[PDB]
Amino acid sequence: WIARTFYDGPEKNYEKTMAILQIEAEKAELRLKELEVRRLMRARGDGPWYQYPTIDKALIDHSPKTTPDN
Amino acid sequence: PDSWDKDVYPEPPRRTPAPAPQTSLPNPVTYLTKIFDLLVDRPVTLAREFIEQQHAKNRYYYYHREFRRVPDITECEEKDILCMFEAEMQWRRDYKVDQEIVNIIQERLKACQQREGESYRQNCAKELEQFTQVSKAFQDRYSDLGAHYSARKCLAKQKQRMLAERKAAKEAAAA
Numbered sequence: 001w002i003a004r005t006f007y008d009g010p011e012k013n014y015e016k017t018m019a020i021l022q023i024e025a026e027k028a029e030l031r032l033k034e035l036e037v038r039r040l041m042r043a044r045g046d047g048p049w050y051q052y053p054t055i056d057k058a059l060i061d062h063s064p065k066t067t068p069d070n
Numbered sequence: 071p072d073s074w075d076k077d078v079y080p081e082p083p084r085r086t087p088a089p090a091p092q093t094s095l096p097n098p099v100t101y102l103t104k105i106f107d108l109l110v111d112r113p114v115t116l117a118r119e120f121i122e123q124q125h126a127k128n129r130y131y132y133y134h135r136e137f138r139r140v141p142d143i144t145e146c147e148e149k150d151i152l153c154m155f156e157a158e159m160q161w162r163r164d165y166k167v168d169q170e171i172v173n174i175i176q177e178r179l180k181a182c183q184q185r186e187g188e189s190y191r192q193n194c195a196k197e198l199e200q201f202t203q204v205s206k207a208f209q210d211r212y213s214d215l216g217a218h219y220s221a222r223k224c225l226a227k228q229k230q231r232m233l234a235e236r237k238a239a240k241e242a243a244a245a
């Protein structure tokens with residue numbers, strides 16, 4: 001009676017544990033991958049991250065400058 | 071009693087002597103057992119029969135749960151968490167079953183020692199030998215794993231034991 005009205009079967013806890021373990025393992029793998037990607041992006045500068053501004057080339061004036069040699 | 075398997079818990083045929091009175095004096099033990107029977111065993115038996123018939127009026131069943139076999143730790147990938155979870159649960163169940171096997175053998179040994187009397191040293195050799203074998207196997211499997219034991223540590227211990235055995239065999243063959 002106690003088992004029938006207060007508890008469930010073993011398979012429920014078993015499969016809930018499986019799902020929880022899958023989620024946690026995926027999160028750990030993602031954390032490691034994110035750290036490695038951050039290291040590579042900061043070292044190389046070839047990714048979307050750690051982009052530091054340079055002078056906009058639209059500010060340059062392309063006209064004759066009263067002197068032939070610029 | 072049918073409540074347990076006679077092969078799992080063996081017993082000798084229990085040969086008992088016959089009463090051979092030598093004198094005409096009536097022994098008090100027999101009379102005391104007769105009055106004990108009349109005053110105790112009959113009412114207890116009647117109450118038991120009443121309770122048993124009440125239980126027979128309401129008969130229902132429960133079952134032993136069967137467990138499938140799953141791949142063990144020896145065929146799990148390094149980081150495949152689901153397979154290690156299943157293998158760990160299976161290994162823990164096997165560990166419990168082995169503990170109960172050792173318990174059964176120990177019960178056999180204790181019953182033999184009590185039953186044999188003054189000749190237990192000679193008449194309980196088989197039980198002692200069985201307990202020695204089972205204890206050796208259990209010690210090889212599970213000793214020194216620690217409180218944080220796991221299937222991986224048991225596999226590591228077995229691998230180291232097999233490496234030592236292989237080295238010793240190669241050394242003895244190449245002697």
Ligand SMILES: CCCCCCCCCCCCCCCCC[C@@H](O)O[C@H](CO[C@H](O)CCCCCCCCCCCCCCC)COP(=O)(O)OCC[N+](C)(C)C
Nearest residue numbers: 001002003004005006007008009010011012013014015016
């Ligand atoms: C002959 C009898 C011998 C045995 C006596 C047994 C005594 C039982 C009392 C002990 C209670 C144990 C505590 C249980 C509380 C937690 C369990 C909880 O999960 O159960 C919930 C049920 O809650 C219970 O109703 C709680 C009972 C607590 C009340 C105790 C009774 C007496 C308290 C006195 C109250 C004040 C009296 C008035 C004074 C003026 C439903 O949760 P649920 O997630 O669905 O379960 C899923 C499993 N399913 C599928 C089977 C449903």
